[PDB]
Structures are given as C-alpha cells and as structure tokens.
Design a protein around this ligand. Structure first.
Ligand SMILES: *CCc1cc(=O)n(-c2ccccc2)c2nc(Nc3ccccc3OC)ncc12
Length: 305
C-alpha cells in the first residue's frame, strides 16, 4: 500500500553540541539556541535544541518522539529539518536554527518594513512546503503564521508537525468547518488553514475573529460569514483566500494551484498588494553567541552520506 520509509534517524552525543541561550520555555520543555559540531568533520551548525522539563513523563515522550519521526522523514527547502536526537535523561531534539524566529512575530514587529514582494514570496514558499507535505500524504493539522519560521527574511519554513498525521486514518479559528463539526482533517482542510495563515500575513499579524468565542465560530461559518478583506489586499489576492474558505473542500484550491497563482502575482507584486511606500523598504559580524567560529555552515548546506 505504501513505500518503505528509509529515513535515517541520527543519534547525537551530548558533548557534540552546546546550548548557548534560551529561546523559549514552558509546556512540555524548553528550546535552546545552540551550536553543533558533528564528530570527526570540522563544521559548526547553528541549532535549536528542544528538551523536556517536567521530568521524563512517559505519557509526554510519545509526542516528542512522534515529532522526531515525522521531521526525519521530510526533506524540503520550505519544511524544517531535524538534524538529530539526543537520548539523555531528557530526550533532546536538535533542529536547524531559524534565526529570525516566528513568522507571526516577524510581521508584527516589522510591519512598517515588509514589502509586497516578501509577502507574496512567503505565500509561495508555504504553499510549496505544504504541497510537499501533500506529496508525502502528511497533514499539518495545525498551519498558522505561528508555525512558520524564518531562516532569512527571504526564506521561511513550515514547522510544528508534532500533531501531524498521515492522510486516511485547539486552533479553532484556523480550522475548517469539516474539522470543527466532524474532526475531519484532509489536505483540503489544510488549505483552509493556509488561507487563514495568508490572512494573518496580509493583516500584518492581526488576530482572526478577534473577540469571538470559538463556540460562535461554527455558526458564523455555517452562516456563510468569513474574514474581512485586508486593506492592502486587492480583490485578486482576497479571492484566493475566500476560495480556501469554501465549505465544499473539493471546491477549495490545491496547494499546487496556490503556488502558481501567488508566483504570477509575485512577478508583478505592486499590482496585487498596495502598501504605502512599498518601493522604499529593505529587509536584512552578524554571528551572535560565538566570536570564535567561521567554520559555521547552515544545516541546509550540511548533508549526510
Ligand atoms: C525546526 C526547528 C524549530 C522548531 C521549533 O519548534 N522552534 C520553536 C518555535 C517556537 C518557539 C520556540 C522554538 C524553533 N525555533 C527557532 N528559533 C527561534 C525560536 C524562538 C525565538 C527566536 C528564534 O530564533 C532565534 N528555530 C528553529 C525552531
């Protein structure tokens, strides 16, 4: 029925990597900024290390290891890569460092400097990663601006596959109606979440259905109400979002189609998004933490035999 998953899972010694700083904490564990030196080879890889805080909850480790399983099985430029696992007292996940953090945080913080070309490009890249997931038959089940991470301002990646599932077996506001009423998730249900994600970027990090109970939400959608058109948005871009939020899932557009549409728009960005002083704006020694290392390589340039 299915092809063998011959992904490699790499086990890392604790000595191989060092933790430099805490990016985040709370929930299952805390995630650290870090440096990883692989074995005999002399290279330094910037990593995000995530490890568990409330002891070794057996309940909890299934979630962390499932995340690792899914992450190892994916190889795509616009999907986040897991370098390794460290089997210490606490399970540790070593992932590629996305220096500029959360895409949601980024749009909010830099809204004044984010041009249409960047926005349309991000839309394209998310569609590409999500289409890749479709090829895999993996479903994100939780696509949001919060779950997209930015390696460079010109290069984002999808993340948070912990909840990810194979096709064919809470973020209510991002969820499709079919998902709300019947707990049904498909690639197409994923597309709807993609539409909400796009809306978040177009609104520069605004919150969808702000000050609405999730209890309300199903009725509203049943009512046929949807998110408002963003100021910056032309009707062409807004229509794409609307198609994503259609009740009939097969009616909704495919990720492969979404790649096509946004790319056309990316060709002539000012026609599809109108932003004050769009022409002016520019978006990003450098290497924080360590002074010592010019042996640093990105995870992306670091490949395995
Ligand atoms: C794929 C790698 C990965 C996963 C991940 O879960 N996080 C993450 C996301 C949200 C909160 C904490 C960690 C990653 N984060 C980062 N970088 C990062 C996180 C928070 C703030 C600032 C950041 O960049 C400097 N990189 C990869 C993550």
């Amino acid at each position: 029925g299915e092809a063998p998953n011959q992904a490699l899972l790499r086990i890392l010694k604790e000595t191989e990597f060092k933790k430099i700083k805490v990016l985040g904490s709370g929930a299952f564990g805390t995630v650290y900024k870090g440096l990883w030196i692989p074995e005999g080879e002399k290279v330094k890889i910037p990593v995000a290390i995530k490890e568990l805080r409330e002891a070794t909850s057996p309940k909890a480790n299934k979630e962390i290891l499932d995340e690792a399983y899914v992450m190892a099985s994916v190889d795509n430029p616009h999907v986040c890569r897991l370098l390794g696992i460290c089997l210490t007292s606490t399970v540790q996940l070593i992932t590629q460092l996305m220096p500029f953090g959360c895409l949601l945080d980024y749009v909010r913080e830099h809204k004044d400097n984010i041009g249409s070309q960047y926005l349309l490009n991000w839309c394209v890249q998310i569609a590409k990663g999500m289409n890749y997931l479709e090829d895999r038959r993996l479903v994100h089940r939780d696509l949001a601006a919060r779950n997209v991470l930015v390696k460079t301002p010109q290069h984002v990646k999808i993340t948070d596959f912990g909840l990810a599932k194979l096709l064919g077996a809470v973020p209510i506001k991002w969820m499709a109606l079919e998902s709300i009423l019947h707990r049904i998730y498909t690639h197409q249900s994923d597309v709807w979440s993609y539409g909400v994600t796009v809306w978040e970027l177009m609104t520069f990090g605004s919150k969808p259905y702000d000050g609405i109970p999730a209890s309300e939400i199903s009725s509203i959608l049943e009512k046929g109400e949807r998110l408002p058109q963003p100021p910056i948005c032309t009707i062409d871009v807004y229509m794409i979002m609307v198609k994503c939020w259609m009740i009939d899932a097969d009616s909704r557009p495919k990720f492969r189609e979404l790649i096509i549409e946004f790319s056309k728009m990316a060709r002539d960005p000012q026609r599809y998004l109108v932003i004050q002083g769009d022409e002016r704006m520019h978006l990003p020694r450098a290497l924080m933490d360590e002074e010592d290392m010019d042996d640093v390589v990105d995870a992306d340039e670091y490949l395995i035999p």
